[PDB]
């Protein structure tokens, strides 16, 4: 007789729906997922150096809150602030708290170098029962509470050069007494004043007497300030009362360091993308887990699924 | 064509003949390999790694603050809307083009076959050819393997076609 030759393509019983420019839903033979939407649940301790703050915030660890003394001279790629973190020291507050936390988190090191300050005329190492360390009262480990010696509080005019080849971060403070009685009884003057300055920069705080709400016994406060000193530039501290002196400097670095808030446990495994919800793999180009991201990550998108067609149109009968 | 052949499980494109000896089904490999090679290169472009980003800005907050919080929020919101649209457009184009290239690959297999059977066959319109000459399992595989000469069956096939 004769012969018949037929051409065609394959198909499958159940194919996958995908989107095109015109059609909203359209069956093809296979598709792959372009949006990562799941997380193991834990943060991976490699390749990033993760530092679990536990009960400490970065600032507390920075300052020297007693239960945060374990975090001394510490380093991180990513600092993790747990939500159970508390403060157990002198009641403080930081103007521009966000900026301090950030600039420190980026530096990634609490490497502190003590310096030889000389406070002739006043009594060093002041302490408090709101900041218990060991058996009795205490303070922030990186701060020096200065008070009168004898019947006097002389005017402090100390200076510290920066003669290294890096940048010095100094953390210091001022004291706000609840009453006038507490003010003169500690810093014999009636109104304090701190002026910390470099060559190019200058700031100066006047203390503010008044009652605050009772926290861990006290109704007085501390205000935390910072100053950065570049090489060649020089620090000058000037105060006739209420100063909270710096014991030295933190070293400043520039690298891929940061901080994140998360309650996900840390585990021993590998993963390059970190979210508050845990580590995720960055194989796919987009993720839907958390807009908060650290490391090599898929870009956060709103969709929870984007199917890339990985085959031809699927037409059965 | 008309529809696909769920019974093909060893390739993407292929032939089905009916002859004197029986009826057979064999998949064409090169055309399959061409469609796979493309869709593969596609994937290589989309999975092609990501961008490293470390210390960014804060994206959650505990306290109302006004202006700056407002800006920090709006900036991230804008960014997400923009990468969302990009993602939504990406799959749409990639998919339309994926589909486009896979049925184009059929039309070059079919057009390759028609140019073989110069005029020893007519096309039914079926996605099939009526071959006007005796063609055993050895003959059609000469069509499959591209090794078919028409001058052989030309005198023969012109006959059945024309009367």
């Amino acid at each position, epitope marked *: 007789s004769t012969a018949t030759l037929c051409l065609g393509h394959h198909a499958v019983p159940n194919g996958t729906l995908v989107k095109t420019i015109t059609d909203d839903q359209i069956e093809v033979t*296979n598709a*792959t997922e372009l949006v990562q939407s799941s997380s*193991t649940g834990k943060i991976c301790n*490699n*390749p990033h150096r993760i530092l679990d703050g536990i009960d400490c915030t970065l600032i507390d660890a920075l300052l020297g809150d007693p239960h945060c003394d374990v975090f001394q001279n510490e380093t991180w790629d990513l600092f993790v602030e747990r939500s159970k973190a508390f403060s157990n020291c002198y009641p403080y507050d930081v103007p521009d708290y966000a900026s301090l936390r950030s600039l420190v988190a980026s530096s990634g090191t609490l490497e502190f170098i003590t310096e030889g300050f000389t406070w002739t005329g006043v009594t060093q190492n002041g302490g408090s029962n709101a900041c218990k360390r060991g058996p009795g009262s205490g303070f922030f480990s990186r701060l020096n509470w200065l008070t009168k010696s004898g019947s006097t509080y002389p005017v402090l005019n100390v200076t510290m050069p920066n003669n290294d080849n890096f940048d010095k971060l100094y953390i210091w403070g001022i004291h706000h007494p609840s009453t006038n009685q507490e003010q003169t009884s500690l810093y014999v003057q009636a109104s304090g004043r701190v002026t910390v300055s470099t060559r190019r920069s200058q700031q100066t705080i006047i203390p503010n007497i008044g009652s605050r709400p009772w926290v861990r016994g006290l109704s007085s406060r501390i205000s935390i300030y910072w100053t950065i000193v570049k090489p060649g530039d020089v620090l000058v501290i000037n105060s006739n009362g209420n100063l909270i002196a710096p014991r030295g400097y933190f070293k400043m670095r520039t690298g891929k360091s940061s901080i994140m808030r998360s309650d996900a446990p840390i585990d021993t*495994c*590998i*993963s*390059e993308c970190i979210t508050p919800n845990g580590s995720i*793999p*960055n*194989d796919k180009p987009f993720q839907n887990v958390n807009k908060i991201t650290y490391g*090599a990550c898929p870009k956060y998108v709103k969709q929870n699924t984007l199917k890339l067609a*990985t085959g031809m149109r699927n037409v059965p009968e | 064509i008309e529809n696909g052949w769920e019974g093909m499980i*060893d*390739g993407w494109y292929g032939f089905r003949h009916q002859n004197s000896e029986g009826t057979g089904q064999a998949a064409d*490999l090169k055309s*399959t*390999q061409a469609a*796979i*090679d493309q*869709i*593969n290169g596609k*994937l*290589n472009r989309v*999975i092609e*790694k990501t961008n490293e980003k470390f210390h960014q800005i804060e994206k959650e907050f505990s306290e109302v603050e006004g202006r700056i919080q407002d800006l920090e929020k709006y900036v991230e919101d804008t960014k997400i809307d923009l990468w969302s649209y990009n993602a939504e457009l990406l799959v749409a184009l990639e998919n339309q083009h994926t589909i486009d290239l896979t049925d184009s690959e059929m039309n070059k297999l079919f057009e390759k076959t028609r140019r073989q059977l110069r005029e020893n066959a007519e096309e039914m319109g079926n996605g099939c050819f009526k071959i006007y000459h005796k063609c055993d399992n050895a003959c059609i595989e000469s069509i499959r393997n591209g090794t078919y000469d028409h001058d052989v069956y030309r005198d023969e096939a012109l006959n059945n076609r024309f009367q």
Partner: antibody
Framework: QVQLVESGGGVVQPGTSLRLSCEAS????????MHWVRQAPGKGLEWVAV????????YYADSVKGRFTISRDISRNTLHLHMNSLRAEDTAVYYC?????????????????????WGQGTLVTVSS | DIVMTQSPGTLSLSPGERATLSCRAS???????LAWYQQKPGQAPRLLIY???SRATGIPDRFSGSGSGTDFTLTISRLEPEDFAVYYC????????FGQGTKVEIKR
């Protein structure tokens, strides 16, 4: 940078089973096709197994089909090779390698890719 | 199953000479999808060429690949003492398959 580190070889008796592991550092394992390649002592290189980035397909050389299964652990970024019913011919050093090309691979006869990075090897001595 | 056939068994050349290795295939590859690996003794193999002619990152300019279809060659323009080793080739035109390897030794 990118690193492959294989683990868990040794002397083991014929017929028994044994699992090999490959730790991937420097890249996401799920973003690549991953291979096993072995080398009997003095002999040359022999391809053994492949797993797509998907985890979706697996293909094996005929000398180990049936007996060897290849797997990945997205969560630990690690690659495994489960060897069953071992024998003396299997005695080799087993490499873990990365494939920057193979992404889509839906038949056992399609194109693959070249081996970008290699681990350093773990030795499997199969003997009575 | 494409089989890869390398020649010769062993090379031998004096340092500074030009080397040239051959790889022939049992079928046509499928896109010059042919790679070349170097393997010093006691080391893992390191990749030299992919797609038959493209140098891998960090490979000196003296290694060059050529060929298409069935017959491929690897040319080493000048032979430095670091280049004496076993050279395998590998196709990925269909599945993955390895050559048997060409050792190039020193001709004293």
């Amino acid at each position: 940078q990118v690193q492959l580190v294989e683990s868990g070889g040794g002397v083991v008796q014929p017929g028994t089973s044994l699992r090999l592991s490959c730790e991937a550092s420097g890249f996401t394992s799920s973003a690549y096709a991953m291979h096993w390649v072995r080398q009997a002592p003095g002999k040359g290189l022999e391809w053994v197994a492949v797993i797509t980035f998907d985890g979706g397909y697996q293909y094996y050389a005929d000398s180990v089909k049936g007996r060897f299964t290849i797997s990945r652990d997205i969560s630990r970024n690690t690659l495994h090779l489960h060897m069953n019913s071992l024998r003396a011919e299997d005695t080799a050093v087993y490499y873990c390698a990365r494939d920057p090309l193979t992404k889509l691979l839906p038949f056992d006869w399609v194109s693959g890719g070249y081996f970008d990075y290699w681990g350093q090897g773990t030795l499997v001595t199969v003997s009575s | 199953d494409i089989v890869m056939t390398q020649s010769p068994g062993t090379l031998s050349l004096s340092p500074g000479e030009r080397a040239t290795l051959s790889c022939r295939a049992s079928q046509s590859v499928s896109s010059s999808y042919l790679a070349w690996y170097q393997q010093k003794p006691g080391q893992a193999p390191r990749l030299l060429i992919y797609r038959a002619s493209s140098r891998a990152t960090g490979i000196p300019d003296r290694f060059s690949g050529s060929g298409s279809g069935t017959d491929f060659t690897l040319t080493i323009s000048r032979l430095e003492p670091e280049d004496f080793a076993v050279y395998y080739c590998q196709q990925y035109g269909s599945s993955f398959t390895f050559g048997q390897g060409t050792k190039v030794e020193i001709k004293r």
